[PDB]
Every structure is written in structure tokens, then in C-alpha cells.
């Protein structure tokens, strides 16, 4: 399709822990989403919320429609569960690495389905609970999902980082090692 | 033994081009798209046997069709114009750095307009041998990344961008 | 106004 820009509303309902997400992406970049537990709009960047204001009830309404469609589709599809797709993980820094200069490490998980996964950051073998940020399960054209994980860190030659991704399609938990 | 899990998703796509909005509404069950509305067609369509009864009922209701036919202007066009200054005109100045890591790397970071072109220059002479560039890396932060390699022989990296009125060089 | 619009998805025929 000839398109200078693409604006897409993406939403999924499922059985496991991510029961529902309702987002809106512009050129494969999420602009806002509704937090269904909080019933409020969440803007990806603060500059978005100052200019626009999205009605949260629209997202809750769409998720309620998709939930009815899921139950209807489960019986019509005779309880068919899709085959699990192993994810592809790549870890890269946001900025060129400079020792002592704060940087953000990005763990990109791509081409996985279903969008149910356990992801943790490991710095020198220990779990990092602070400075971690996770993106939503962003959609893909092949109807798979991809997710971003972020970790703010200060580079050091001694420190080594690992991105632990657990998925049903993975035979074993996958760890992507990154160091300076 | 993957646990029991059933998924249902959907896409409401607005395609903008030459001042024209084309609306697509997909109905997907476990990666299997079974129904679709196309503003060019003007009605629903069954992608597989799974969604035939659904598309036939939607096409039988005139108001369901009329609501979807008004989407290109009510939603696709309106959201395209309202978000224009924050989406179309979103400009970020790229930061360029060159490092030796013999190959030379020109790492360009923090630029939102994805379209960007990078050229190596040796003593004022652009080289095209041994030059391999990574594909555009989306950081998921509305910021992009790209690295260009260069097979050099030891004895400047210029970048052109929409946000940049004058190309930036790093020596 | 200053708000983006949304369109109801439809319910599959039961």
C-alpha cells in the first residue's frame, strides 16, 4: 500500500497474564496506550500528552469487544492453540559507549508468539530491579510481537550484562551477553 | 508442554498518501487473520473460512458498513491532521561519532526521521569499497540508530538528514 | 477538539 505515514490501532486479548493491551502506533512507534487496570491513557512521550488527550473508555470498550470475540472464536476454532514461535534477541547500547558516561542498554526481543514471556536484566549475575524499563508488546505485520527492554547503566570494563528471556517456544532460557 | 492459551487481536490501520486516507480493519485469531474491512472495497471480506459467517452478517447490516465507511474522514483524516505537528514534523538532531573499534565505524544516534544517508570520505574522496552499513535500528524510543563500517588503510563521516539544514561532519 | 478518535471493533456473529 502506497503510504507516506501509517497510523494503526493495535489491540490483543489472550488467556494468560497480558490479558489485554490497547495501543496506537505511528510508523511502528507507539504513541499512547490505555492502562486497563488504571483506566487511564498513558502517553509514551510527555510532549504527546500536552497536545492531545485520548478518551480511555475507547480502549476499554474495544478490549471488551475483543474479549467477546475471543470466546466466540475459541469455540468456533475448536480450541486450536497456535504453535509457539521462538524469539530472536539482540542487545545494543543506545549511545556509543563511553566509560563513566551514563548510557542506556536496549534488549530487543523480536518475532515471538504468543506475547507471554519472562524477561529480567542481569548485571554481573545479579538481578537489576532499578533503572529498568519495558515497552509494550508491539505488533508486527506477520501478527507476531516484539518487545523492548531498557536498562540505564554506567559502562565499566569489569561489568557484564545479560538479558534473560524466557519463552514457551524456547527450549531453554536464552541469555544475551553484552559487555564493553 | 506449552500451557493452554488462546489469543485474539486486531488492527485498525490508516494509510495516508497524497491527502487520501485508506482504512483497514483486520480481525485476527492466533495470528490467523480471518476478516478484513477495506475502505477501497467498501464492505467486509472473509480472509479464510473461519470468518465467512461474520463478514456476511456485517455486510447485511447497513449501519455497520456506514460506520466503517465514515472512518477514513472521522478518524484516519482527523487523527492524521491533529497529530501532524507531533508526528509528521517530529524532528530530532542526530549525534554522530566515529570510532576505530582495521575498520572504521560511524555511529549515528538520536534521529527520529528514519530516512538518513551516510557517506565516508577519505582525504576528501568518497570511498565505496568495504563500506557496509547496518540496517536502521529502531530503539523503540521514537529514536533511531545506524552504523556504517569502512575497510580503511591507515596512513571524515558526513551525514545528511531532514532535521539538519546543513550536513554534519565528524573528523 | 484536541482528542484523537477511535472506532469500535465489531462482534463476530455468534
Amino acid at each position, epitope marked *: 500500500i502506497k503510504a507516506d505515514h501509517v497510523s494503526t490501532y493495535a489491540a490483543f486479548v489472550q488467556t494468560h497474564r497480558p490479558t489485554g493491551e490497547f495501543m496506537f502506533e505511528f510508523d511502528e512507534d507507539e504513541m499512547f496506550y490505555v492502562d486497563l487496570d488504571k483506566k487511564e491513557t498513558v502517553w509514551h512521550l510527555e510532549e504527546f500528552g500536552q497536545a492531545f488527550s485520548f478518551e480511555a473508555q475507547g480502549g476499554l470498550a474495544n478490549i471488551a469487544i475483543l474479549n*467477546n470475540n475471543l470466546n466466540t472464536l475459541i469455540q468456533r476454532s475448536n480450541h486450536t492453540q497456535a504453535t509457539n514461535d521462538p524469539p530472536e534477541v539482540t542487545v545494543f547500547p543506545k549511545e556509543p559507549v563511553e566509560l563513566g558516561q551514563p548510557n542506556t542498554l536496549i534488549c530487543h526481543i523480536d518475532k515471538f508468539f504468543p506475547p507471554v514471556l519472562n524477561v529480567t536484566w542481569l548485571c554481573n549475575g545479579e538481578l537489576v530491579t532499578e533503572g529498568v524499563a519495558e515497552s509494550l508488546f508491539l505488533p508486527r505485520t506477520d501478527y507476531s510481537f516484539h518487545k523492548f527492554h531498557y536498562l540505564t547503566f554506567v559502562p565499566s570494563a569489569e561489568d557484564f550484562y545479560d538479558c534473560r528471556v524466557e519463552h514457551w517456544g524456547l527450549d531453554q532460557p536464552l541469555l544475551k551477553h553484552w559487555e564493553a | 508442554a506449552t500451557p493452554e492459551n488462546y489469543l485474539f487481536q486486531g488492527r485498525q490501520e490508516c494509510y495516508a498518501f497524497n491527502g487520501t486516507q485508506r482504512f483497514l480493519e483486520r480481525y485476527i485469531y492466533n495470528r490467523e487473520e480471518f476478516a478484513r474491512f477495506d475502505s477501497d472495497v467498501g464492505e467486509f471480506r472473509a480472509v479464510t473460512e473461519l470468518g465467512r459467517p461474520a463478514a456476511e452478517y456485517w455486510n447485511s447490516q*447497513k449501519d455497520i458498513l456506514e460506520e466503517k465507511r465514515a472512518v477514513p*474522514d472521522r478518524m484516519c483524516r482527523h487523527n492524521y491532521e491533529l497529530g501532524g505537528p507531533m508526528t509528521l514534523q517530529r524532528r530530532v538532531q542526530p549525534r554522530v561519532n566515529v570510532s576505530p573499534s582495521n575498520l572504521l565505524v560511524c555511529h549515528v544516534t538520536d534521529f527520529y526521521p528514519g530516512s538518513i544517508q551516510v557517506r565516508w570520505f577519505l582525504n576528501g574522496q568518497e570511498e565505496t569499497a568495504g563500506v557496509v552499513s547496518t540496517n536502521l535500528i529502531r530503539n523503540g524510543d521514537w529514536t533511531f540508530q545506524i552504523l556504517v563500517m569502512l575497510e580503511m588503510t591507515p596512513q571524515t563521516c558526513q551525514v545528511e538528514h531532514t532535521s539538519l539544514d546543513s550536513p554534519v561532519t565528524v573528523e | 477538539a484536541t482528542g484523537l478518535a477511535w472506532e469500535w471493533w465489531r462482534t463476530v456473529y455468534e
Partner: T-cell receptor, first 113, second 106 residues
Framework: AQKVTQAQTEISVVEKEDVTLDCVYETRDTTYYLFWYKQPPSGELVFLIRRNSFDEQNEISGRYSWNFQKSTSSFNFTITASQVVDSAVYFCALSGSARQLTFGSGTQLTVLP | SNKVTEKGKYVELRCDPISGHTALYWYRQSLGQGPEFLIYFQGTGAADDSGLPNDRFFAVRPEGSVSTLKIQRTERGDSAVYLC???????????FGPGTRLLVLE
């Protein structure tokens, strides 16, 4: 916002006369749906009409009439020949972006004998 | 039906929709005024635009075959006629049931 206004509080006519109950819908939706409901004494809300936003051609088609004027944003219910059984409270409803109904106030018709 | 309840007691109201209707709506009508929207059910879930009055008002529809509006800590002001309408799909004509008149007495 989405609101329905029926300013006629009470209408009194003898039988075989003509009456016209009025609404003025007030919604921002692009596609809306208007309804008329009848609530007889100690009775349920009976369905009478549903005219969608796109269908604009008006008809008489019996004793019950409806004139959907998008210009005035009005929707007027007209009864040709009044019978004492038509004596009830009639309601104006509006739907669309909100799938539930935005009922108006009350118009009580009393067909006298 | 018609319900009478002493102030404070817990009440729940029942509504059986028509068969294939996937859309259930609760309305409340007070003093013959305009019916007020309460909650909108679409199958097993609530797509409501949240006309529910307080935290004391909650509703469920486990299988889409029947909804139950629950009122804890009944107050006199909660006394009204609670209507119930069902739509075949999301957007079809809604047909109201007889409703249950709630009355909260001191």
C-alpha cells in the same frame, strides 16, 4: 455533548385530533441513531422507531409519522388521529458513539375523550 | 417484579435478556423522568461507559444469559425503577424488559 431535549411537559388533546411531539438531539458523533419509546401507564418502554443517521428520506406510512431534520437537529413524532389508548409518556433516545441510550426528558400525552 | 428493602440491607436485581442478544443494558428511571444509563454488558464482560452511581453499585453477567445488578448498603435515594434492555448485537435496537421497582424504606 450528547444530550436529548424534549421541552414539551404535557400535551392535552381530544380524540381524533393531531399531535406532534418534538425532540432536539444534540450529539457530536458522526454516525448516530435516534429512537422513540412509549411508556404506557404502569408499562414497559415500548419500541416505536429507529431512524439511522444516513437514512434521511421521511415518510408518513400510517398514523405514526417522523420528520428527521438534520438541519434543525430535530426528530418530531406526529400522530395523525388521536385515540385514548395513545395516551402515554413518549421518550426520545439517541445512540451512536455511545452504544447505550441517551434518553431525553418526558412528554406526557393525554388524549381526552 | 417489585422489591421492598429496609435501609442498609443488600439487594440484587435480576434481568433475563432475550435469547441470542449479545448486548445487555441496565437503566434506572426515577420519578417518571428520563431513564439513566447504568452499565453496558457485551457478553461476559462490561464495556460500560460507567453510569454506575457509587462503589455500592456493581453488576455481573457470567454467561451473557442473565445479568445481576447488586446494590450494597441500600439508601432511600437508591429507590427507583431499574429497567433492562437487550440488543441482538452492538448497535441494534434495544427492547426493554418490565424491570423491577426498588424501594428502600427506613
Amino acid at each position: 455533548a450528547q444530550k436529548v431535549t424534549q421541552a414539551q411537559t404535557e400535551i392535552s388533546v381530544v380524540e381524533k385530533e393531531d399531535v406532534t411531539l418534538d425532540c432536539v438531539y444534540e450529539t457530536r458523533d458522526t454516525t448516530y441513531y435516534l429512537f422513540w419509546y412509549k411508556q404506557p401507564p404502569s408499562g414497559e418502554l415500548v419500541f416505536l422507531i429507529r431512524r439511522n443517521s444516513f437514512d434521511e428520506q421521511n415518510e408518513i406510512s400510517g398514523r405514526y409519522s417522523w420528520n428527521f431534520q438534520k438541519s434543525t437537529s430535530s426528530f418530531n413524532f406526529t400522530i395523525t388521529a388521536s385515540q385514548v389508548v395513545d395516551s402515554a409518556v413518549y421518550f426520545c433516545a439517541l445512540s451512536g458513539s455511545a452504544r447505550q441510550l441517551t434518553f431525553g426528558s418526558g412528554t406526557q400525552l393525554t388524549v381526552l375523550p | 417484579s417489585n422489591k421492598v428493602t429496609e435501609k442498609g440491607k443488600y439487594v440484587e436485581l435480576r434481568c433475563d435478556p432475550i435469547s441470542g442478544h449479545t448486548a445487555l443494558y441496565w437503566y434506572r428511571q426515577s420519578l417518571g423522568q428520563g431513564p439513566e444509563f447504568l452499565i453496558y454488558f457485551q457478553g461476559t464482560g462490561a464495556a460500560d461507559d460507567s453510569g454506575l452511581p457509587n462503589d455500592r453499585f456493581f453488576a455481573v453477567r457470567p454467561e451473557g444469559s442473565v445479568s445481576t445488578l447488586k446494590i450494597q448498603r441500600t439508601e432511600r435515594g437508591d429507590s427507583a425503577v431499574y429497567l433492562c434492555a437487550s440488543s441482538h448485537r452492538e448497535g441494534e435496537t434495544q427492547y426493554f424488559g418490565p424491570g423491577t421497582r426498588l424501594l428502600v424504606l427506613e
